Structure 1
Amino acid sequence: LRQFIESFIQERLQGKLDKLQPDEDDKRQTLLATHRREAWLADAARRVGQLQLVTHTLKPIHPDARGSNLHSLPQAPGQPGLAGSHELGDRLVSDVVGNAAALDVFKFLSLQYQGKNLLNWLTEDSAEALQALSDNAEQAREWRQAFIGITTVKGAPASHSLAKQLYFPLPGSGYHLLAPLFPTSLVHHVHALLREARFGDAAKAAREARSRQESWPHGFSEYPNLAIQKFGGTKPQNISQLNNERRGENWLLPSLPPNWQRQNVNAPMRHSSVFEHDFGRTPEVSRLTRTLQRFLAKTVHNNLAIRQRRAQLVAQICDEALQYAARLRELEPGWSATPGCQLHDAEQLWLDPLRAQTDETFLQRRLRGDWPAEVGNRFANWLNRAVSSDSQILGSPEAAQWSQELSKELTMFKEILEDERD
């Protein structure tokens, strides 16, 4: 290449040099065309050995940590469902660690080693070793002292007292002390959550086409509940290359329970209940029942993957009904059930604790709790009256399949409602 050090002279004295006053005659007026032009790295040979090219580093754990930053890429596990940094190798971006003088010398050192252009020939112009300059070795003895020290950084594998060390028990034996590092390259690769997914152009095009109900074969993705982990302080350059497009921050994926953002104190039954009888209160009114199981239900032609989710999506409702029962089981230390209820009855086995008191209704309710079709069939019909526009299932052998899983949730629901009253 030839234009690589030649594109530096037109950007300096054209825009920034607007007036040169005689009050200053020290560095930019006399020395810039003398020593600062080509042989300028003589006095700048103290930031060039300062850097290090890493993949896993230590300073995001704590900025005052002075152990080892390592480059060594991992091996593959060999076990199925495990995701790490081992699946990179040509898509990885190698982090640089040093001072605040790592913008120019890094781009200068990067291009010559990574990015060579040898693909075409295996025989022709591959056996060449005499296409060098071929100069003498005695003429340049004294002042060429920088050939060997340009690469060799120090070793000395160390950790730090603020570096997050941990013990891991071996099988039938002692321990290994594990010191995890922060993966810069993997967090950088996952910071391509931005352009292809969140607010790049092809994603927001399909977000526009979602509102207009259009159709092209790019569906988009939506990432809820991400968190921001900001590294550095006000200075995300004393840590890493956190300055180009990852502005000293880290996007975190959620790992939350369903108990996440649960409502504080549940509403007790039989005070103003007109809609909420066996549904519970759930936020998936427009989510689980409206759009989920109601598309490609009228033109079902295969029965391999269709009725499995129709079998388990109602098992989810049968589970979350018991979840609602368990939430209203605790957390409610009082009952005043005399007003407000005119269609909600026979629930003393379902939403009532023992209370150390005979809450009987002229029956043997307090020590015996059988025939629980006052709940089981009573929401097994609630599930059927969640939809009434389905018409052509009648007179078909597939309507028997709908009564299979409701013969199943009328199998597994009885004895888990008798065993609480004893």
Structure 2
Amino acid sequence: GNAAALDVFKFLSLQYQGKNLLNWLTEDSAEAVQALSDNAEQAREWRQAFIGITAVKGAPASHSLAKQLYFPLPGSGYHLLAPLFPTSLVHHVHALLREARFGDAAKAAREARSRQESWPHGFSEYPNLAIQKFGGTKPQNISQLNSERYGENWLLPSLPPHWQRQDQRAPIRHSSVFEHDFGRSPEVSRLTRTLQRLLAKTRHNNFTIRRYRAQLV
């Protein structure tokens, strides 16, 4: 909505024992005379004006700058397929990615690794994230959730394996190319070192580790 109007939502989300029964305040009984302690008519009027405008549509539109892309049907025909941005889902994914790093469990389980220990559990890293900042200087124009997560799309990588691996060289110097400039290649080293890590282990659960040892070769 309008950025000047967001104080109304800040009043609705005033967590007096929950903001779900106040923003969608359909089940209020004592709050009515608290909205207007002068009458009972304008109290019900303000209650309807607050809870009625939070479910309204108008008309379906996409104002010539949104996306709408054809989809080929099986026999013949098309559907227009105008997509939208799923801000609750992008909120929930960003909150999981914030909980896995800056949380209490990750802070506890990283201190154990700085000291080479055991502890109840482990942790994760989430590499190659990217930032896509929707609001330029003031994110209140787009969304309230775009203001709580200012800019900060927090996208996840779908890259090819060899993307940051540009190198151009010819082995004119060394005689044997398998021993030298093959292990010196950037990707082969983490295959070979993990193979040294895997070729000294237990053979009791062979059905998975032999498959991993075969796929790594």
TM-score by length of 2: 0.73
Deviations along 1:365-408, one digit per CA (max 9) or x if unpaired, are xxxxxxxxxxxxxxxxxxxxxxxxxxxxxxxxxxxxxxxxxxxx
Displacement of 1:310 in angstroms is 1.1
> Is the alpha carbon distance of 1:209 and 1:145 closer, same or farther for their aligned partners in structure 2, counting shifts above 3 Å?
closer
Unaligned runs of 5+ in 2: none
Displacement of 1:293 in angstroms is 5.4
Deviations along 1:84-110, one digit per CA (max 9) or x if unpaired, are xxxxxxxxxxxxxx1223443214334
Unaligned runs of 5+ in 1: 1-97, 315-422
SS at match of 1:305: helix
Q: Is the 8 A contact 1:236 1:242 kept in 2?
A: no
Displacement of 1:297 in angstroms is 3.5
Displacement of 1:116 in angstroms is 9.0
Q: Distance in 2 between matches of 1:129 and 1:145?
A: 10
> Is the alpha carbon distance of 1:295 and 1:132 closer, same or farther for their aligned partners in structure 2, counting shifts above 3 Å?
same
Match of 1:168 among 71, 91, 104: 71
Q: Is 1:101 aligned to residue 4 of structure 2? A: yes
Q: Kindly indicate which of the two structures has a greater share of residues assigned to strand.
A: 1
> Is the alpha carbon distance of 1:253 and 1:300 closer, same or farther for their aligned partners in structure 2, counting shifts above 3 Å?
same
SS at match of 1:147: helix
TM-score by length of 1: 0.41
Q: Distance in 2 between matches of 1:288 and 1:264?
A: 19
> Is the alpha carbon distance of 1:113 and 1:165 closer, same or farther for their aligned partners in structure 2, counting shifts above 3 Å?
farther
> Is the alpha carbon distance of 1:125 and 1:202 closer, same or farther for their aligned partners in structure 2, counting shifts above 3 Å?
closer
Q: Distance in 2 between matches of 1:135 and 1:237?
A: 35
SS at match of 1:251: coil
Q: Is the 8 A contact 1:194 1:200 kept in 2?
A: no
Partner of 2:145: 242
> Is the alpha carbon distance of 1:137 and 1:124 closer, same or farther for their aligned partners in structure 2, counting shifts above 3 Å?
closer
Deviations along 1:210-251, one digit per CA (max 9) or x if unpaired, are 232111132111111111111011111111124654112211
Q: Distance in 2 between matches of 1:125 and 1:269?
A: 82
Q: Is 1:121 aligned to residue 24 of structure 2? A: yes
> Is the alpha carbon distance of 1:265 and 1:178 closer, same or farther for their aligned partners in structure 2, counting shifts above 3 Å?
same
Identity of aligned residues (%): 93
> Is the alpha carbon distance of 1:209 and 1:296 closer, same or farther for their aligned partners in structure 2, counting shifts above 3 Å?
farther
Q: Is the 8 A contact 1:165 1:180 kept in 2?
A: yes
SS at match of 2:211: helix
Q: Distance in 1 between matches of 2:203 and 2:194?
A: 16
Q: Is the 8 A contact 2:129 2:157 kept in 1?
A: yes
Q: Is the 8 A contact 2:13 2:19 kept in 1?
A: no
Displacement of 1:123 in angstroms is 21
> Is the alpha carbon distance of 1:234 and 1:171 closer, same or farther for their aligned partners in structure 2, counting shifts above 3 Å?
same
> Is the alpha carbon distance of 1:134 and 1:251 closer, same or farther for their aligned partners in structure 2, counting shifts above 3 Å?
closer
Displacement of 1:308 in angstroms is 0.8
Q: CA RMSD in A?
A: 5.8
> Is the alpha carbon distance of 1:293 and 1:206 closer, same or farther for their aligned partners in structure 2, counting shifts above 3 Å?
farther
Q: Distance in 2 between matches of 1:295 and 1:286?
A: 14
Q: Kindly indicate which of the two structures has a greater share of residues assigned to helix.
A: 2
SS at match of 1:250: coil
> Is the alpha carbon distance of 1:172 and 1:274 closer, same or farther for their aligned partners in structure 2, counting shifts above 3 Å?
closer
Deviations along 1:7-49, one digit per CA (max 9) or x if unpaired, are xxxxxxxxxxxxxxxxxxxxxxxxxxxxxxxxxxxxxxxxxxx
Deviations along 1:286-339, one digit per CA (max 9) or x if unpaired, are 53233455258443222221211111111xxxxxxxxxxxxxxxxxxxxxxxxx
SS at match of 2:192: helix
Q: Distance in 2 between matches of 1:243 and 1:113?
A: 24
SS at match of 1:142: helix
Partner of 1:232: 135
Q: Distance in 1 between matches of 2:66 and 2:25?
A: 48
> Is the alpha carbon distance of 1:240 and 1:128 closer, same or farther for their aligned partners in structure 2, counting shifts above 3 Å?
closer
Displacement of 1:260 in angstroms is 0.2
Q: Which has the larger radius of gyration?
A: 1
> Is the alpha carbon distance of 1:178 and 1:141 closer, same or farther for their aligned partners in structure 2, counting shifts above 3 Å?
closer
Q: Distance in 1 between matches of 2:205 and 2:179?
A: 36
Displacement of 1:143 in angstroms is 11
Q: Distance in 1 between matches of 2:62 and 2:173?
A: 62
> Is the alpha carbon distance of 1:160 and 1:143 closer, same or farther for their aligned partners in structure 2, counting shifts above 3 Å?
closer
Q: Is the 8 A contact 1:197 1:203 kept in 2?
A: yes
Q: Distance in 2 between matches of 1:120 and 1:105?
A: 10
> Is the alpha carbon distance of 1:260 and 1:123 closer, same or farther for their aligned partners in structure 2, counting shifts above 3 Å?
closer
Displacement of 1:200 in angstroms is 2.6
> Is the alpha carbon distance of 1:281 and 1:232 closer, same or farther for their aligned partners in structure 2, counting shifts above 3 Å?
same
> Is the alpha carbon distance of 1:224 and 1:271 closer, same or farther for their aligned partners in structure 2, counting shifts above 3 Å?
same
SS at match of 1:179: coil
